[PDB]
Design a binder for this molecule. Structure first.
Ligand SMILES: CCCCCCCC/C=C\CCCCCCCC(=O)OC[C@H](COP(=O)(O)OCCN)OC(=O)CCCCCCC/C=C\CCCCCCCC
Ligand SMILES: CCCCCCCC/C=C\CCCCCCCC(=O)OC[C@H](COP(=O)(O)OCCN)OC(=O)CCCCCCC/C=C\CCCCCCCC
Ligand SMILES: CCCCCCCC/C=C\CCCCCCCC(=O)OC[C@H](COP(=O)(O)OCCN)OC(=O)CCCCCCC/C=C\CCCCCCCC
Ligand SMILES: CCCCCCCC/C=C\CCCCCCCC(=O)OC[C@H](COP(=O)(O)OCCN)OC(=O)CCCCCCC/C=C\CCCCCCCC
Ligand SMILES: CCCCCCCC/C=C\CCCCCCCC(=O)OC[C@H](COP(=O)(O)OCCN)OC(=O)CCCCCCC/C=C\CCCCCCCC
Ligand SMILES: CCCCCCCC/C=C\CCCCCCCC(=O)OC[C@H](COP(=O)(O)OCCN)OC(=O)CCCCCCC/C=C\CCCCCCCC
Ligand SMILES: CCCCCCCC/C=C\CCCCCCCC(=O)OC[C@H](COP(=O)(O)OCCN)OC(=O)CCCCCCC/C=C\CCCCCCCC
Ligand SMILES: CCCCCCCC/C=C\CCCCCCCC(=O)OC[C@H](COP(=O)(O)OCCN)OC(=O)CCCCCCC/C=C\CCCCCCCC
Ligand SMILES: CCCCCCCC/C=C\CCCCCCCC(=O)OC[C@H](COP(=O)(O)OCCN)OC(=O)CCCCCCC/C=C\CCCCCCCC
Ligand SMILES: [Cl-]
Ligand SMILES: [Cl-]
Ligand SMILES: [Cl-]
Ligand SMILES: [Cl-]
Ligand SMILES: [Cl-]
Lengths: 312, 312, 312, 312, 312
């Protein structure tokens, strides 16, 4: 079995198409995600007679060991894909339709800045292998490419699934090495994050802030320090869901700002008690009345500035 | 070898059937589980027959490789199943008996919106391919669908296992391909969740609610804040086992409501102390007496509303 | 490559035997364990006997293939075993010898009603199908069943390893089969659980109880609530134990009882303070002196009753 | 091919030798450890030496499928090794040199008593399958046995690696009775454990002991109980770097003794406060002054006794 | 297919080149990392020339079963590489161009002292199996070794990727062969570690230090002990990022010093209270005024000494 011979130096055109079936196991630390999907290759197959007799108009069924099947290699994968060939339907003429389910572990970078409200773009790269016949070119068949409407990823919604031609631009560049890029755009569902992570932190912070309406030093110390312990425990709780991230993040900036605010509150309580002991109650009362307005307003301004700095 | 002649008016009918041996490893994060079962097939082929005459005592015949066998592929499986042929028998008329045994991983969605008191459903899909000469359509054998009594999942009780034929031309492909659906219905065993999760949290909340029978500010602060810390630790303990759900469930709503109640209790304690300091004890007494009855009634009403909203 | 023909109707008998090497990885939540062992077989076949005098030998050897070897399969395994044959020797009359080494992971349910002091039984099943017109039944070789003195498992004591001689013949997929049962009996080593779990919780409970000799309300609140937090943290540290179960175990009942005791202690402290504030010190003193004796006696009685219930 | 034929009843001696390279992934809960190492065999092949000639004195190279390769099995591996032949050379006349790089998962018992200051001993067992010719015997070639001196067994320092021949006692067959035993002695580096574990806990205990210089009941209660909570949290922290050991250990004994000391300290504080309230300050002063000296001395004596009991 | 025959005893020089594509999963406990990358060889054949015709200027095409492919084996890998040939093209001159893809699991030593500001150097070793026709010598091809500029290890940056020829230095010199060394230098990105781990601990320590401006024993005890609990909780939180390291580290030294400072602060508070009770407020005030300056200065000097000790 060999590919079709040359006809008139016309470049051989291959119309590929990837039809998604399943997408699962989106691992962040490994920066991978498994896929389970179909694949279609429709290559013009003249000069290989397929019984074009008008009495043989039946669509012929062929096994993999019947003709030359173009072998496409994925660039960013862990191992070679498993070729679970599904069905090949070939007309009495040189027209080819073919479907095959594969499973692979794909490598694709993920950007986790602006983490709870982020979007991603997964990539799949395809190259074609050399052959002794004329040069093989890559083209996209827009009818074949799609998704199964039943692909479910835990916590995301799928926007689009398109394809485009991009030159490989590899340093080897033994030939042109035409390459295909498949882009899967996904968006994270963020609503549950508000009640799960955001509101409890604000409740704890306000419980801490109730110490500006009091004057008992022991009660203030207990309030602020126990609230700090609760904040650390809640950070431990929320650290499990988040992925390990060796760079700065919006949530991390918020956590750091909360730590800073706790430190400043402790300083304010200490100053108030020291003045009250040294008998300057007017100054102590003025400072403790100023704090009640100062803290929430500065917190709001810092949040606005951080939001602008991280979301354009 | 070759497909049977397409002489019969109806398409070549098969008679599938799945007999469960055991199920195991019901993963929740990736929403997949493993299975081990048989797969019996049956169809009629008049091309070969065994007459009772001419020493026709050999009613059955074993043809391992020199025979045409229909091919059945699972749709929602991570990898292709690993099957070993067991037996092949041929009736004197022409009906063929087939049998296998396989293991696989199955991808199936799960719905944890009633996490403790939820019921699931697991699907297995089968597909037969078309052949050029004849036509093949799937069917079910009610005498070959069942399960052992040793099937067990850790924490679930199995209720039923049935089959139903799905329409052809599934998805966008339209090569007259049929599909079969096998449904396994399970229910979670929820009794152990009550004394392990629900009652201790209620005990902690009731312990925190005893601050309404006291007028010592330091004791009230200690009670409420330390019970908040205990609630956070118990939340860590609870979330250890609950699967991670990127959506809103019943338990998350209950936990958020508990956080809100803690916040309101802190506010009430602060207001009472502030009123007492300004030499207005009657108003503070009235407020605390009102809250003593107000808190449990509102908690019960909110619980009733949530229960009606999620289970109705 | 063919089953032997019967003389008149006699079924064929295969004598098996399993010799353990080491058991390990006895997981509790998944209810599985791993094993590697020797598998021995022997069966009668009169179509391959020779003449010892002419052949000059007494036992003729063979290859792993090119001889009719019965299909032996384990019922409750996740995947097929990993086999590597060691020998196939033939007796002069016709009986054959076989040996191989395998490794597998076995599925078996467990019972945790007496979790610290429980005993388990593990089952390994062997089955065989009726091949051709020669029915096959299994038998047990008592001299090929045993285990090494170096068979060890971390934290368990191995008592016996026997095989039930009588098989259970039945019909499956319109064919007859025979099944064998291998039973391994183990018992948990329970000493290390006493100083690691049992005693620290009692010490913390007594530390909590020490608040019946004090009259300061703040100190009592601190003692009881801090000890409750310590109990919750200890339960977090201990939770790496038995999984969720439909039934109620011994340890869960003990933990729930301790929670109830903490709740009642908080109630008593609050009642004493409330009575003291209303200027009725005599009732508070009487209640405290009563509780000093009431709590330990009721705790001991409840422990005795639970011990009788779960082990009687 | 075939093994060399007998010449003068001289047994074939296979001088073996293992050359360790990597010893890693020491998983103690599973009580295994993966190994990556070479393996050299030299079986004398006289009367079958190929191309003995001074002109062709250059060492000859043979592919693995050119000469007979002995089959050596590992007794205590979870699965069969993944062999990788590197280079096998045959002299013009004489012996044959062989070398393969295999990686295997080995199951060996681990004794975790005396955990910080423990020395282990890993074992590998080898057997060789016999053939129809004279019995294959195993002997250790001391010249090839050794290490790469570049073993990445971090946390341990290798002391020796030797071998010896022992009789085999498992399912005796009058053959396969000449197994080998390779012992790898390792010792744990215990310096970092001192600052990482030992000293913080002593600091915490000494912090708790400062309650014997104070007569404030509330301060003493806060000190002792909060110190107990800190001890529980630090135990949680320590438990991560330690496998599940279902048996008694030196560290566990120390931890239990620390819990006992906390309980006794709480008892002493309560007794002192009760005596002070009962208008008997002299007994309280005597008791606290006695405790100041009594506690550290008893702690030191108990530590000495426990050390002598565990370390001989 | 056999290696090229000798021409004039000239060794067949092989110009090797590794072109990186993907580096991922830098697991530290197992001391491994996975590499997905290309590979190239530039051996030529003189006697077995490839089409020395001037009409064949077009580059010929070959497959794996077309020429002799060298046997190059990695030394420090877990198991054999997953070879995946992509291109094998031969020019009419006689030179060969090769392109494959592999994904191996490499074992390379790592050093985690000076952990947040450290650099690493990963090694890959190559050896080629010799043949009896000639002697094979490995030389580095400088036009092939390189990176794809899109290699992403999460949290590192790539400095250089270079190759060098070194002696084998193995104690078992089978054929006096050679070896290659490929070095990849990476430096950790340390910016996020400051806000993530460093500043919160300083804030907590200063919150502890605010107790030298107070004179209430109860408040001081609460501050210091609760701050110690918070420090332990934060250590638990940050333990999930660091690798399990069985040797000393800069961060571990910092943690130990923080524990020591907490112990000394507790001692100082106890001494102050004891003197104040014993009626020496002058001495108490002197010590408490000295501490305010003594503690930060000693902390700074100790940090400077530790930094000099660990960073030369
Ligand atoms: C009452 C008077 C006492 C006040 C005492 C204040 C002490 C302050 C000590 C220094 C803390 C603040 C400076 C922090 C320096 C390090 C920077 C830092 O932590 O920033 C983290 C983080 C974000 O990092 P970016 O630089 O935006 O990252 C994006 C670009 N890669 O900053 C914030 O969250 C700022 C919060 C306000
Ligand atoms: C090094 C990092 C900080 C380590 C030390 C812990 C911080 C302790 C802060 C002390 C606050 C109490 C001092 C106080 O009350 O001073 C009174 C003083 C007035 O003194 P007279 O009554 O005139 O005498 O009141 C003040 O206004 C003091 C200044 C306010 C505090 C300014 C910020 C605190 C210092 C910076 C800490 C963080 C640095 C990073
Ligand atoms: C004061 C003491 C209060 C003690 C309260 C104990 C609460 C445990 C209740 C367990 C019983 C649940 C039960 O019977 O469930 C049956 C039924 C089965 O589900 P379906 O068949 O789908 O029915 C829905 C359609 N009608 O489930 C329900 O109806 C659940 C309704 C809510 C009951 C659970 C109550 C939980 C209360 C949480 C309180 C806060 C805890 C912190
Ligand atoms: C569900 C709703 C329960 C809410 C959970 C918190 C409630 C707190 C329990 C009451 C605290 C103490 C009450 C108190 O001081 O009562 C003393 C008061 C004495 O005052 P007189 O002079 O008789 O008027 O009455 C008593 O002695 C009552 C004794 C028993 C009361 C507690 C019994 C259990 C309460 C409900 C438990 C949960 C069900
Ligand atoms: C956001 C940060 C919130 C921190 C906590 C703020 C509230 C603390 C308590 C306020 C307080 O004591 O107010 C007493 C105040 C003063 O009374 P006069 O004698 O008229 O003066 O009393 C009242 O008016 C009673 C009701 C006060 C409002 C209750 C709080 C409302 C909710 C505030 C936070 C909402 C988010
Ligand atoms: C439940 C725990 C709450 C303790 C208080 C409940 C009783 C309310 C007040 C009863 C009362 O005043 O009794 C008066 C009466 C006599 O008073 P005089 O005037 O001195 O005569 O007091 C008594 O007789 C004292 C004993 C009666 C109250 C019982 C006290 C002990 C309570 C706990 C019992 C053991 C519970 C153990 C745990 C069980 C659940 C896990
Ligand atoms: C194991 C069980 C350990 C717990 C049992 C008690 C051990 C400690 C008792 C030692 C002190 C008793 C003698 C003494 O001097 O007590 C003082 C004084 C009265 O003595 P007079 O006769 O006035 O002299 O008694 C006290 O102060 C009592 C101390 C209370 C603490 C002990 C209670 C602990 C909590 C209950 C534990 C129940 C375990 C079952
Ligand atoms: C008395 C208790 C405090 C002094 C004893 C400290 C014990 C040693 C210790 O903890 O050192 C760890 C640590 C770092 O290790 P080095 O000794 O610098 O070098 C390690 C490689 N050889 O040292 C320190 O903590 C020094 C700062 C105090
Ligand atoms: C090891 C066990 C450690 C237990 C905790 C130690 C607590 C020490 C408190 C001592 C104290 O308050 O002494 C005050 C004491 C009163 O002096 P008079 O003799 O009254 O003059 O003050 C002093 O002596 C000055 C300070 C010396 C104390 C130094 C303590 C060092 C302890 C290190 C242990 C390792
Ligand atoms: Cl591929
Ligand atoms: Cl399949
Ligand atoms: Cl099997
Ligand atoms: Cl092996
Ligand atoms: Cl390799």
């Amino acid at each position: 079995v060999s590919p079709p011979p040359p006809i008139a130096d016309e470049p051989l055109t291959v119309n590929t198409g990837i039809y998604l079936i399943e997408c699962y196991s989106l691992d962040d630390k490994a920066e991978t995600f498994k896929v389970n999907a179909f694949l279609s290759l429709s290559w013009k197959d003249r000069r290989l007679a397929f019984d074009p007799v008008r009495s043989g108009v039946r669509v012929k069924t062929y096994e993999p060991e019947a003709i030359w099947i173009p072998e496409i290699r994925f660039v960013n994968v862990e191992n070679a894909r498993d070729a679970d060939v599904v069905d090949i339907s070939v007309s009495p003429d040189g027209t080819v339709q073919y479907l095959e389910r594969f499973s692979a572990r794909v490598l694709s970078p993920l950007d986790f800045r602006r983490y709870p409200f982020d979007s991603q773009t997964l990539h799949i790269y395809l190259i074609v292998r050399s052959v002794d016949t004329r040069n093989i070119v890559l083209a996209v068949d827009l009818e074949k490419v799609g998704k199964n409407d039943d692909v479910f990823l835990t916590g995301w919604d799928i926007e689009s699934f398109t394809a485009v031609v991009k030159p490989a631009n590899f340093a080897l560049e033994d030939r042109l090495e035409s390459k295909l890029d498949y882009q899967l755009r996904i968006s994270r569902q963020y609503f549950s994050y508000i009640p799960n992570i955001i509101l409890p932190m604000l409740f704890i912070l306000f419980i801490s802030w109730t110490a500006f309406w009091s004057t008992s030093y022991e009660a203030n110390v207990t309030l602020v320090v126990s609230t700090l312990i609760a904040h650390i425990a809640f950070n431990i709780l929320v650290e499990t869901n988040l992925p390990k991230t060796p760079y700065m993040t919006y949530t991390g900036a918020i956590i750091f700002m909360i730590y800073l605010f706790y430190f400043v509150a402790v300083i304010e309580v200490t100053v108030q008690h020291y003045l009250k002991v040294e008998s300057q109650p007017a100054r102590a009362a003025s400072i403790t009345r100023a704090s009640r307005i100062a803290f929430p307003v500065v917190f709001l301004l810092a949040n606005i500035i951080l939001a602008f700095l991280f979301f354009g």
